[PDB]
Design an enzyme around this catalytic site. Structure first.
Site, PDB file in Angstrom:
ATOM      1  N   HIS A 256      -2.663  34.957 -67.267  1.00  9.47           N
ATOM      2  CA  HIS A 256      -1.242  35.291 -67.389  1.00  9.47           C
ATOM      3  C   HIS A 256      -0.905  36.774 -67.393  1.00  9.47           C
ATOM      4  CE1 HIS A 256      -1.426  31.102 -68.902  1.00  9.47           C
ATOM      5  NE2 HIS A 256      -0.273  31.004 -68.268  1.00  9.47           N
TER       6      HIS A 256
ATOM      7  N   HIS B 282      -0.606  37.228 -61.708  1.00 10.33           N
ATOM      8  CA  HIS B 282      -0.058  35.874 -61.683  1.00 10.33           C
ATOM      9  C   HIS B 282       1.439  35.977 -61.407  1.00 10.33           C
ATOM     10  CE1 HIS B 282       1.223  31.875 -62.919  1.00 10.33           C
ATOM     11  NE2 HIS B 282       1.890  32.365 -63.949  1.00 10.33           N
TER      12      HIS B 282
ATOM     13  N   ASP C 175       6.543  35.143 -67.141  1.00 11.46           N
ATOM     14  CA  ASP C 175       5.430  35.208 -68.086  1.00 11.46           C
ATOM     15  C   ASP C 175       5.254  36.573 -68.761  1.00 11.46           C
ATOM     16  OD1 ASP C 175       4.481  32.615 -68.102  1.00 11.46           O
ATOM     17  OD2 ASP C 175       3.144  32.896 -66.389  1.00 11.46           O
TER      18      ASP C 175
HETATM   19  C1  LIG Z   1      -6.149  27.039 -61.797  1.00 13.03           C
HETATM   20  O1  LIG Z   1      -6.101  26.200 -62.943  1.00 13.03           O
HETATM   21  C2  LIG Z   1      -4.904  26.297 -63.629  1.00 13.03           C
HETATM   22  C3  LIG Z   1      -3.872  27.119 -63.199  1.00 13.03           C
HETATM   23  C4  LIG Z   1      -2.688  27.178 -63.916  1.00 13.03           C
HETATM   24  C5  LIG Z   1      -2.510  26.428 -65.068  1.00 13.03           C
HETATM   25  C6  LIG Z   1      -1.204  26.530 -65.820  1.00 13.03           C
HETATM   26  C7  LIG Z   1      -1.006  25.337 -66.794  1.00 13.03           C
HETATM   27  N1  LIG Z   1      -0.935  25.959 -68.116  1.00 13.03           N
HETATM   28  C8  LIG Z   1      -1.061  27.273 -68.176  1.00 13.03           C
HETATM   29  O2  LIG Z   1      -1.054  27.972 -69.192  1.00 13.03           O
HETATM   30  C9  LIG Z   1      -1.227  27.737 -66.770  1.00 13.03           C
HETATM   31  C10 LIG Z   1      -3.550  25.600 -65.502  1.00 13.03           C
HETATM   32  C11 LIG Z   1      -4.750  25.538 -64.777  1.00 13.03           C
HETATM   33  O3  LIG Z   1      -5.820  24.736 -65.130  1.00 13.03           O
HETATM   34  C12 LIG Z   1      -5.710  24.136 -66.427  1.00 13.03           C
HETATM   35  C13 LIG Z   1      -5.756  22.621 -66.248  1.00 13.03           C
HETATM   36  C14 LIG Z   1      -7.051  22.059 -66.820  1.00 13.03           C
HETATM   37  C15 LIG Z   1      -7.809  23.223 -67.447  1.00 13.03           C
HETATM   38  C16 LIG Z   1      -6.976  24.472 -67.216  1.00 13.03           C
HETATM   39 ZN   LIG Z   2       3.190  31.314 -65.154  1.00 14.20          ZN
HETATM   40 ZN   LIG Z   3       4.210  30.731 -68.709  1.00 14.59          ZN
END
Ligand SMILES: COc1ccc([C@H]2CNC(=O)C2)cc1OC1CCCC1
Ligand SMILES: [Zn+2]
Ligand SMILES: [Zn+2]
Ligand SMILES: COc1ccc([C@H]2CNC(=O)C2)cc1OC1CCCC1
Ligand SMILES: COc1ccc([C@H]2CNC(=O)C2)cc1OC1CCCC1
Ligand SMILES: COc1ccc([C@H]2CNC(=O)C2)cc1OC1CCCC1
Ligand SMILES: [Zn+2]
Ligand SMILES: [Zn+2]
Ligand SMILES: [Zn+2]
Ligand SMILES: [Zn+2]
Ligand SMILES: [Zn+2]
Ligand SMILES: [Zn+2]
EC number: 3.1.4.53
Lengths: 334, 327, 334, 327
Positions: D75, D79, D116
C-alpha cells in the site's frame, strides 16, 4: 515473555552486546540488527529491569513491552536518522549520564523515569523534515501548534497518546501526584530538545556551573525544581547531541544518516520550488566541514560545560569528541 | 424602525472608552462582536484596504461569534467584542499615531476578536487536572490560548469565511505570526514577564520628532501590540463603574461555576472559585492592586499622558470597591 | 449535596420523583430542576443501581459519577432540545422499554449496558444544528467525517473519548472481549439514530415482525447478532422518537424546545443567506401541522411496528400517541 | 535525459492495460504517482478544462505522494499510481465513450490517487484491536478509508496545493461527494453489495443511440464509478503474470509483517498473515475465485467486450498460481 523483551535465536549474541548497556559507546546498531530492529524495546526493557523501575512503579511486564513496541512502531523505519535507533541511542546515553558519580542519589526514581521516558519518546513520529519545512508548507501540524516547536510538541502528544492503546498504560499504578509530576518533567524535557532553545539552555547551564554547589558527599546540590529540571533538560539535550562524542565508528554512521536525511529534505525542497535549507544541498555539501563546525559552535561548547558540572566524570567523553573533531578536520578536502 | 435608531446611537461611541457594550449586545439580538467588528472595520476602512468582500466578513464574524459560548458568563462574545473595541481605542491613542501599518492594525483587531473563542468557562489548570483531550494535545502549555488561535484560524476555512482571501501570501504570512504572538500573550501565566519587559521598554523609551513613540524592529512593535491587547483584555476595572460591575458579576459567576464543578468532582476548589468563602469586593481590590493597576500604570508611562483619564477611572473604581468591604 | 448522611430538602424531593424512574412519563424536567441541572447523571446513576450494573461490571461508583458528570458537562446547556435533559429522557425511556414483558430475560447485561450507555451519549456535544448545516458551511466536523452521519459519528467519538479523562473509565474492569462487544453494539446503536437511516431501519423491523417468533410465552426469540442488535437499535430509535408518546404536558415542552432549536438554525441560515431548512423558518411555521406530519409519517409508523413486536405490551403508549395526534390535529388553525 | 527518454517511452503505454508501473517508479526517482497523474491530466486536458495551474498540480501531487509510506511494501505510492493509471484505462472503455462528464472523470482519477494515502500497512481490524487513535476517531467503521479521504482533502490546504481552487462551489460540492462515495466503497467490507448492485445494473442494462452505456441518475453514475475504481484497486491478478507476481510478493510481505507484529504482541494472528502457516499460492487462487473473478466477470459483463482480454489474462494467471499450489 522472552529474555530481552522480544523473540530472537541470536539471543546469546544479543545478551553479550547488552552487557555494555551501562557503557558509553554501546554498539546500538548491532543491537538493532540482533533484536530484529527492536533496539528501543530491548534497550528500554533492559534499563527498566536494571533500574528496578517495574517493581518500583508497579508496571506490569507485558504492559511495558506492549507500550515499547507500540512506541517503537511509531518511529519511522524510512527515516535515516530520526528513527527508533536514534531513540534507543538517546535513551541509553541518558541512562549512562544519569549514572555519573557527580549525580549519585541526586534524582528520585520518578525523576529518573521521567528523563528516560522523555528520551524514549523525544523524537517519536518524526517525519524526517524540520519544523521550518512543516511551517512553510502550512502543514496541519504547524497549524495545530501555532508554528511553535511543532515537531517537539508533536513528539510529546504522540508519546503520551500511545499510552492509551490496548495494554499500553505503563503509568497506570502511579498516583495522581506522581503522574502530574512525571508528565510535567517529561514535557519540560522534550520541549527543551528543540535546537532553537539551545543557546538559552547552554546559557543557563553555564550560570549553574558558575554557582555550582556540592553536598558533603561529592554530589551536585539541586535545591529546587528549577535547578533539577534544568539539569535533566541539559542532560537529555547532551544525550541527543552525543553522536560526535561516541567512538568514531559509531559517530561516522550517525553522520552518514543525518546527512542522508538532510539531503532528502533538500531534494524535496527543490522539487517543491523552495529554497534548499542549509546543509541539505547534496550538490553544495561539505559533510566534513559541517561536522567540524557542528562540534566547534554547538557540541563542544555544550559538552565542555556539562563536563564542568560533573567534573571530572565526563573527561573521556570530551577527549573522544576532540579526537573525532580532528579526524573530520583531517578529512576535509582542500 | 426604533430598534435600528437606538442601536446606531450606541454604535456612535465606538471610538470612545466606555462604550455601552452590554446595551449593544441586547439591541443587536446578541451579536455585539459581529456589529462592533464590522463597525470598526468600516471605521478603519479595513474592508477597502484589504479588499474584504462584505458578505464574507459578516459570514466569518457570525461564525466566530457563534463559536463563543452563550452559556459562559464571562468568556463569551460580549467579552470578545469588548476587547476588540478597547484595542480599537488604544490603537488610536496619540503617542501611536501613524506608527502601525494597516496590516498590524488588522492583526491586533483580529487577534482581539478570536483571543478567547470556544472558551469552555474553566481554566487551563482545570483542563490539565481532568486530563482533557485539549490539554493532552497542547502538552499542558497555554492550552486554551493555543486552542483559541486554532479555532480562530480554522473558522476562516468554513464556507465563504476567508476574510483574508485577497491578502497576498506575504501579508497572510506576516499577519498569522503577529496574531499568534498576540493571542499567546493573553495567557495570564505570562503576565509577569510581559509587564517586566514592558517596563524595560518604557525605560529605553524613544519618541520621534513627531512626539510619537518610535518602534524600529519587529520585537519592539509586537511587544507593544501584545501589551496593548493584554491591557484591553484586562480593562474591565478601568471602565465606567456601570460596566465594570457587570463584568465582575459575570467573572464571579463563571469562577463560582468552576468551583461548583470542582466541588462536584471532589477536586480541591480553586482560589476565588468557592462561592461559600468568597470576597468579591476584596478580590476586586486585590486584582487591581497586584495586576490591573500595576500594568495600566506602565502602559500610561509608554503613552504618557494619553491614558491619564483611564488610569484615574481605575483608581476611582478601586476606591468604590474598597469602600464596599464590610467588617 | 447531603448533610450528615441524612438527605437535604431538595435531594429528598428529587429522590421521591425518581421513584417513577421505571415509568413512562417521568417528570424529567422536574428532575432536571431538582438535580441542579444534572438529570443525566442522576437518572443514569439511579438506573445503574436499579439494574445492579455497578457490581456486575465492577464499576467503581466514584468513577461512574465522575464520567457521568463529565459526559453531561459535554451536552450544551444553550441548546434548547438536543441537551442533557433529552439525553436523560432517552436513557430513562430506553430503560422502560428494556423492561417490557415481551423482552424479559431476552438480553444479556452487556447488551442492556450497551443500550443504556448508547442512549446516554447518543447526542453528546450536539451543536444545535443538523448534519446538512454542518456540511453546507464546510465545518471541520463535516470534513473529518466525510459528510456521512457527521453528528452521530461525533457523538460516539466524544462519548468514548471522555472515558479517558481523570478517573472516567467506567469500563476499566471489563475484559477485552466484553469491551469489544460492548463497543461494537454501542456504535451500531448510535449510528442508527441518524434519521437518514430511519426508513431502512423501520423496514427491517417490520420484516422481523413479519417473521416474529415467540417461545409460546410472548418472550421474543432473537438468535443471531443481526436480530438482537436490530431490536436494540430500533428500541433506542423509539426512545429518541418517544416525545409524541408521552403525556401531552411533557410532549408540548419537547415540541417547544425542538421548534426553538429549529428556528435558531433558520435564523443563522437566513443571516448567512443560506436557504432556510424545512420547518426552520419562524415566519412561515405550522407547528401543529408539522407535528401531525411528524407523527403520521414517521413516529406512528415506527411505534405501531414496535407495538406489534411486543404486543400487547405497548398498547397504552400507542393510545397516548394517537390521542396526542388528534389533539394537535384539532389545534391546527384553519 | 538518457533515462528521460526511456521514461517517456514507457509512458507511451499510459493508455495500455499492463503498463510497467514499477519501471516508471524507478526511472522517475520514485515519483510514479506524480508522473502518471501529470501525464494523464494533460492527456485529458484536465489542467485547461478546470484551469488547474501546473504548479499547484505538481505541488499537490508531490505532497500527496509524500504521504504514502515508502516503508510499506504494498500500500504505497506505486500501488496508488497503478490504481490511477488503471482507472484511467477503464474510463476509456468504448462502452463508456462520452458517458462521464469531465468533473466525474476528475473525481474518479482524484479518488484513485488518494484512495490509500497514509496507509500504515496494517488492516482496519489491527487498528481497531489496538484501540488506535484512528479507530476511536472513526468508530471502528471504515477506519482507514475515512482516513484516506480526510488526508486526501486536507492536503489540498497546504501551500499552493488546492488544485480545485478554480472550480465553482457547485463543482466542488459535487466532486467532493463523488470522491467520498468512491473511496469509501474501496473498503473490502463493502465488496459484496457493491458487486451485487453492479450485477443488477447489468441485468437492467440499457444503452443510448450511439450504443454507449446509459447512466441516468447519480445513483447509477456513481455506482459505475465506484465499481470502476474498485476493479482498478482489485486489478493485480488481471495484469500480465510478471507484474501480478510482483504485487503478490508485495502484499504478502505486508501481510507477514502484520502477522509478525500481532505475534510479538501476543495478539491473534490474522488469516494469511502467518509466515509459518502460509498458503500464498492457494490464497491467490481463493482471492481470484471468490472475489477478483466474480468482480471482473461482471465489469467485462458491463463493458462487453472491451474487458475481454483482461478477463482472459485473469483466468490464465489463476491457472498458473493453481499449478504452484503444493500437494
Ligand atoms: C496480489 O494479491 C493481492 C492484491 C491486493 C489485495 C487487496 C485486498 N486487501 C488488501 O489490503 C489489498 C489482496 C491480495 O491478495 C490477498 C488475498 C489473499 C492473500 C492476500
Ligand atoms: Zn488500494
Ligand atoms: Zn485501501
Ligand atoms: C551526525 O551529526 C549530527 C548529529 C545529530 C544532529 C542533530 C542536531 N540537529 C538535527 O536536526 C539533528 C545533527 C548532526 O549533524 C548536523 C551538523 C552539521 C550538519 C547536520
Ligand atoms: C473584573 O473581574 C475580572 C475580569 C476579568 C478577569 C480575567 C483575569 N483572569 C481571568 O480568568 C479573567 C479577572 C477578573 O477578576 C477576577 C480576579 C479575582 C476575582 C475575579
Ligand atoms: C416532538 O418534536 C420533535 C422532537 C424530536 C425530533 C427529532 C427528529 N428529528 C430531529 O431533528 C429531532 C423531532 C420533533 O419534531 C420535529 C418534526 C417536525 C418539526 C420538529
Ligand atoms: Zn527532536
Ligand atoms: Zn533526537
Ligand atoms: Zn483568554
Ligand atoms: Zn479574554
Ligand atoms: Zn442525534
Ligand atoms: Zn436524540
Amino acid at each position: 515473555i522472552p529474555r530481552f523483551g522480544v523473540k530472537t535465536e541470536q539471543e546469546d549474541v544479543l545478551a553479550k552486546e547488552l552487557e555494555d548497556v551501562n557503557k558509553w559507546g554501546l554498539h546500538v546498531f548491532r543491537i538493532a540488527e540482533l533484536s530484529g530492529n527492536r533496539p528501543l524495546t530491548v534497550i528500554m526493557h533492559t534499563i527498566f529491569q536494571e533500574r528496578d523501575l517495574l517493581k518500583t512503579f508497579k508496571i506490569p511486564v507485558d504492559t511495558l513491552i506492549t507500550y515499547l513496541m507500540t512506541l517503537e512502531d511509531h518511529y519511522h523505519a524510512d527515516v535515516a536518522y530520526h528513527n527508533n535507533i536514534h531513540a534507543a541511542d538517546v535513551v541509553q546515553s541518558t541512562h549512562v549520564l544519569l549514572s555519573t558519580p557527580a549525580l549519585e542519589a541526586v534524582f528520585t526514581d520518578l525523576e529518573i523515569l521521567a528523563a528516560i521516558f522523555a528520551s524514549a519518546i523525544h523524537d517519536v513520529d518524526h517525519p524526517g523534515v524540520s519544523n521550518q519545512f512543516l511551517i512553510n508548507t502550512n502543514s496541519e501540524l504547524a497549524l495545530m501548534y501555532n508554528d511553535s516547536s511543532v515537531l517537539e510538541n508533536h513528539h510529546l502528544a504522540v508519546g503520551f497518546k500511545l499510552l492509551q492503546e490496548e495494554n499500553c498504560d505503563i503509568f497506570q499504578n502511579l498516583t495522581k501526584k506522581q503522574r502530574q509530576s512525571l508528565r510535567k518533567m517529561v514535557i519540560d524535557i522534550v520541549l527543551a530538545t528543540d535546537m532553537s532553545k539551545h543557546m538559552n539552555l547552554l546559557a543557563d547551564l553555564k550560570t549553574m556551573v558558575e554557582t555550582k554547589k556540592v553536598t558533603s558527599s561529592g554530589v551536585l546540590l539541586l535545591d529546587n525544581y528549577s535547578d533539577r529540571i534544568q539539569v535533566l533538560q541539559n542532560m537529555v539535550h547532551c544525550a541527543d547531541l552525543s553522536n560526535p562524542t561516541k567512538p568514531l565508528q559509531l559517530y561516522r554512521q550517525w553522520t552518514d544518516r543525518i546527512m542522508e536525511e538532510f539531503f532528502r529534505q533538500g531534494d524535496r525542497e527543490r522539487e517543491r520550488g523552495m529554497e534548499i535549507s542549509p546543509m541539505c544541498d547534496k550538490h553544495n555539501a561539505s559533510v566534513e566541514k559541517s561536522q567540524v563546525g557542528f562540534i566547534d559552535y554547538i557540541v563542544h561548547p555544550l559538552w565542555e560545560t556539562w563536563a564542568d558540572l560533573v567534573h571530572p566524570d565526563a573527561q573521556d567523553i570530551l577527549d573522544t569528541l576532540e579526537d573525532n573533531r580532528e579526524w573530520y578536520q583531517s578529512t576535509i578536502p582542500q
